[PDB]
Design an enzyme around this catalytic site. Structure first.
Site, PDB file in Angstrom:
ATOM      1  N   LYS A  87      -3.591   7.215   4.185  1.00  0.00           N
ATOM      2  CA  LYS A  87      -4.635   7.354   3.159  1.00  0.00           C
ATOM      3  C   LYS A  87      -6.032   7.136   3.742  1.00  0.00           C
ATOM      4  O   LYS A  87      -6.326   6.055   4.242  1.00  0.00           O
ATOM      5  CB  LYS A  87      -4.402   6.366   2.001  1.00  0.00           C
ATOM      6  N   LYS A 145     -13.951  -0.107 -10.736  1.00  0.00           N
ATOM      7  CA  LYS A 145     -13.010  -1.100 -10.203  1.00  0.00           C
ATOM      8  C   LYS A 145     -13.090  -2.376 -11.066  1.00  0.00           C
ATOM      9  O   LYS A 145     -14.083  -2.575 -11.762  1.00  0.00           O
ATOM     10  CB  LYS A 145     -13.344  -1.417  -8.735  1.00  0.00           C
ATOM     11  N   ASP A 184     -10.827   1.360   2.255  1.00  0.00           N
ATOM     12  CA  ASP A 184      -9.721   2.097   1.686  1.00  0.00           C
ATOM     13  C   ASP A 184      -9.274   3.305   2.530  1.00  0.00           C
ATOM     14  O   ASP A 184      -8.495   4.123   2.066  1.00  0.00           O
ATOM     15  CB  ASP A 184      -9.999   2.446   0.221  1.00  0.00           C
ATOM     16  N   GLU A 191      -6.570   6.425  -7.482  1.00  0.00           N
ATOM     17  CA  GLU A 191      -6.758   7.760  -6.895  1.00  0.00           C
ATOM     18  C   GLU A 191      -5.911   7.966  -5.645  1.00  0.00           C
ATOM     19  O   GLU A 191      -5.539   9.093  -5.349  1.00  0.00           O
ATOM     20  CB  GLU A 191      -8.249   8.030  -6.622  1.00  0.00           C
ATOM     21  N   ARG A 234      -2.749   7.291  -4.827  1.00  0.00           N
ATOM     22  CA  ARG A 234      -1.423   7.873  -5.006  1.00  0.00           C
ATOM     23  C   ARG A 234      -1.506   9.373  -5.327  1.00  0.00           C
ATOM     24  O   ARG A 234      -0.658  10.156  -4.903  1.00  0.00           O
ATOM     25  CB  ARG A 234      -0.614   7.102  -6.061  1.00  0.00           C
TER      26      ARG A 234
HETATM   27 CL   LIG Z   1      -3.456   4.371  -6.171  1.00  0.00          CL
END
Ligand SMILES: [Cl-]
Ligand SMILES: [Cl-]
Lengths: 449, 449, 158
Positions: A220, A232, A237, A298, A300
């Site tokens: 990712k 959030k 990330d 977002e 996944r």
């Molecule tokens: Cl996620």
């Protein structure tokens, strides 16, 4: 000559009077500096604890403590791996000391305005093990650099450019997809999530092809995650993509008889007049649909189509790595990753690899009763239930996209990828490069079998 | 004659035209009622799914669905355990059907102002298995009743009285400690936590002594938890004590060759002018100290001294059961308990027992690196770190109080002890009696070995 | 009569259930045009410069943050001596804008008005009915409506 020599001491081992007077009792990572016997240089006595309880992690931590205690020296020789008497074999000692030295010396000063240390030497006949450890640690530090990089520098296009340059260094095959070429691949989740941002998304495939086993790694790469419109409850990330890229860069040096393909979706998640909306439905590459019930889940959605592509009718195994869920950390704490897989043999391989690497993982179950929390009133599934169990639900969500019959594991590394508490042992504040060394040890084990 | 007969049907099994016209396709727990062949009574066709995939849980759930579909009938005969063709052996089918019938019929109407069903019959030659299942389910329903009971009725003194009455029914040995007799035991955590409430605390020991193995069970009995002065982010926090009491009541019927002692601290956690304060220090029975950093983490403080007492120099094994932490649920979801133990063999015993019982547990690690979050600036430890990982930290906290060398397991059942989502399968809304059947199956396995 | 009333209700249900990414203001205006054509209800769709000319300042201010442009639709049943105007709020996605909420269903009023209008030709009521349907998204954006801004309306008030 070495300006500083670091001597490993198990509990009960002899040290001089000065060292005793300073309170040296060989606690793991305790360091007491003293003059060398001839008075021209420095000796560090470095604790390794009881010989009977010492592990490879003891040596890794002692090496990091040694390098932190060097002062203004130009040259450091670590004799720690020469300490015998523990159950840790010589090669394992050498590998761990080499790793701890590199990991402990790590600094990220690229963005400060305004190191006398020129050489660190690891003393041991186990030269192969030293080389292996240096390479694993250098890959870890690459991942640390990528995570630490400000999102304004490491945008999705810039990250794709950096991967291309890294690939060129060993002639890993590298394909970068952008614009119309990206649209053709049908990675709908990536393009939907990425659209709000002024930065366009990228998709990169990076292949090591030196074999009979082919492994797919999915990482990712959300370079900045604001939470989107939902907010959030942010540059880190992309820790999963960083770990995958770094592991791939280490393979040519190790020369494993194993084909490995990296699959790297890169995007920003931003609020904007054109951003992904709550209630939108994504139609994925496999024809199934996801309802966006929260724009902060977002990751996944981005991974879904890449897992379809990576497992399509061919990779023998697919492993994804992602800073996916915050729910993980509540019960596991900040230093342990979550492992999901339906394959018990694969679980044991990953867990043993993490133990060799000194990285903490806990296997969590793919609970069939949590699938009810994926239900949508509109689409095939939701990306957020607003209920407890999101770490397990996210794993079940991803599982839907892995083609029937393909062995798969998912590593959720949200908490240990970034250390927002102080430095400790071989781990700095900030980007940690967590999972790089677990991935390398996993690939080593798979290549043997 | 039976007013209603429930027939188990695997996928592909023949049903009449009416049943087909109503859409019966043998989905697990699907029920379609029709007239009996002679037109005098009712037949329920009850789905058991594919023969190849059916488990004991399938039978348990089908029996609960059957009893829910009885209407105003006086008598129900379940023929479900006669369905063969699955891999579930006849005795396992009979035990599961008997359990599901009792569990599915459960109602808690004691506090409503203003059941034609007189007999449920389970058809099978496996009469021993039916008896075993009825007894396990009746124990589960005892725990459900205790959890469902309003805290104003089930105060600590009232709960101690109820345990005494239950013990008398098989002549389990029972000692109730109160007032000065309680003070003598030195259970400092219990008396500190319990002092704010107008209700005084109690400590109860309940012993089954029918053996060569002696097992100690410790159950958290906080009958009402308001969070104390610190507040929560409330009658169900005695679910652990309920499970332990209920398991003990089932042992005389089963006749296991095993000595089992229950240890049950009972109290309310209330705000008050005399309530436990943030910053207070508790000196425990083992001489160690705990700093109260949050009054809502009272369970671990109450259990501490009881674990000292239970493991003191003798029980071969100690198992605690407690609705301990909310952090658990965030990653595990609402239907899965957490299991902690350093003993891999004990872990496998508990996990296999839960599988037989149809209860979901996940083993979590006793992470050595989370012990740093127990550190206090004043005492030996804190009861709250205010950091992520509280489920693991609570287990480590409890571990400190178990005497050296004594095998121990901890079951954190906070979420599955109370169902605040709808009823499903054999589980009602409200108190569930979770862990009763796992405990019984664990004790059965331990008694064999 | 009952089937027709229920079918109109289900049209409104479909419009509300539709994801905001499908039922954008331009897409919603297109759908209304198609529905109108089915009985030859008169339908005028205003967009861009033609919309600006009407002076619906509130609609254009609220709608500007979104990447989707706003629309205004007038839909008339003219089969009478009584003329009824129906006004339906058609915010196809409401994020709360810059201020935030404490989101696809905020066009339920426009859905109800459109659906009621579609039922009138079947019933054949001796009544002229005009629908007035402002359609927009409310989104945060660098160009979105700001707290403290003042809207000067069509009647000159602020
Ligand atoms: Cl996620
Ligand atoms: Cl607690």
């Amino acid at each position: 000559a070495a300006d500083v020599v670091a001597c490993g001491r198990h509990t009960g081992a002899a040290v001089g009077a000065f060292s005793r007077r300073r309170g040296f009792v060989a606690r793991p990572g305790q360091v007491v500096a003293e003059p060398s016997a001839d008075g021209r240089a420095v000796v560090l006595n470095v604790g390794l604890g009881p010989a009977g309880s010492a592990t490879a992690a003891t040596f890794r931590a002692a090496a990091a403590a040694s390098v932190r205690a060097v002062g203004p020296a130009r040259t450091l020789r670590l004799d720690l791996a020469l300490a015998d008497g523990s159950g840790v074999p010589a090669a394992e000692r050498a590998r761990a000391v080499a790793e701890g030295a590199v990991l402990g010396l790590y600094r990220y000063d690229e963005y400060r305005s305004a190191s006398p240390l020129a050489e660190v030497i690891v003393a041991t006949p186990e030269r192969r093990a030293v080389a292996e450890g240096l390479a694993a640690a250098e890959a870890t530090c690459l991942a640390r650099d990528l995570v630490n990089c400000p999102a304004g520098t490491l945008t999705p296009p810039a990250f794709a450019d950096r991967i291309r340059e890294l690939a060129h260094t060993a002639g890993l095959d590298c394909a970068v997809y952008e614009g119309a070429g990206l649209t053709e691949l049908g990675l709908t989740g990536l393009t939907a999530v990425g659209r709000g941002s002024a930065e366009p998304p990228r998709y990169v495939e990076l292949t090591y092809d030196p074999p009979a086993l082919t492994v797919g790694l999915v990482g990712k790469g959300v370079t900045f995650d604001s939470g989107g419109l939902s907010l959030k409850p942010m540059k880190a990330d992309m820790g999963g993509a960083a770990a995958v890229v770094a592991a791939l860069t280490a393979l040519p040096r190790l020369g494993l008889p194993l084909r490995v393909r990296g699959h790297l979706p890169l995007a920003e998640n931003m609020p904007d007049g054109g951003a992904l909306r709550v209630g939108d439905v994504v139609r994925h590459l496999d024809g199934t649909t996801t309802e966006i019930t929260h724009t902060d889940n977002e990751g996944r959605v981005v991974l879904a189509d890449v897992l379809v592509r990576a497992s399509r009718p061919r990779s023998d195994l697919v492993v994804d790595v992602a800073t996916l869920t915050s729910a993980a950390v509540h019960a596991l704490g900040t230093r342990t990753g979550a492992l999901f897989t339906p394959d018990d043999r694969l679980a044991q391989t990953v867990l043993a690899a993490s133990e060799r690497a000194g990285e903490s993982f806990c296997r969590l179950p793919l609970l069939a009763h949590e699938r009810r929390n994926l239900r949508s009133a509109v689409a095939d599934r939701v990306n957020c239930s607003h209920r407890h169990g999101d770490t397990i639900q996210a794993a079940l969500f991803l599982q839907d996209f892995v083609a029937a019959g393909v062995p798969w594991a998912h590593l959720d590394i949200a908490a240990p990828a970034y250390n927002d508490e102080g430095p400790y042992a071989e781990v700095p504040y900030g980007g940690t490069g967590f999972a790089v060394r677990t991935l390398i040890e996993t690939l080593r084990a798979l290549s043997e079998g």
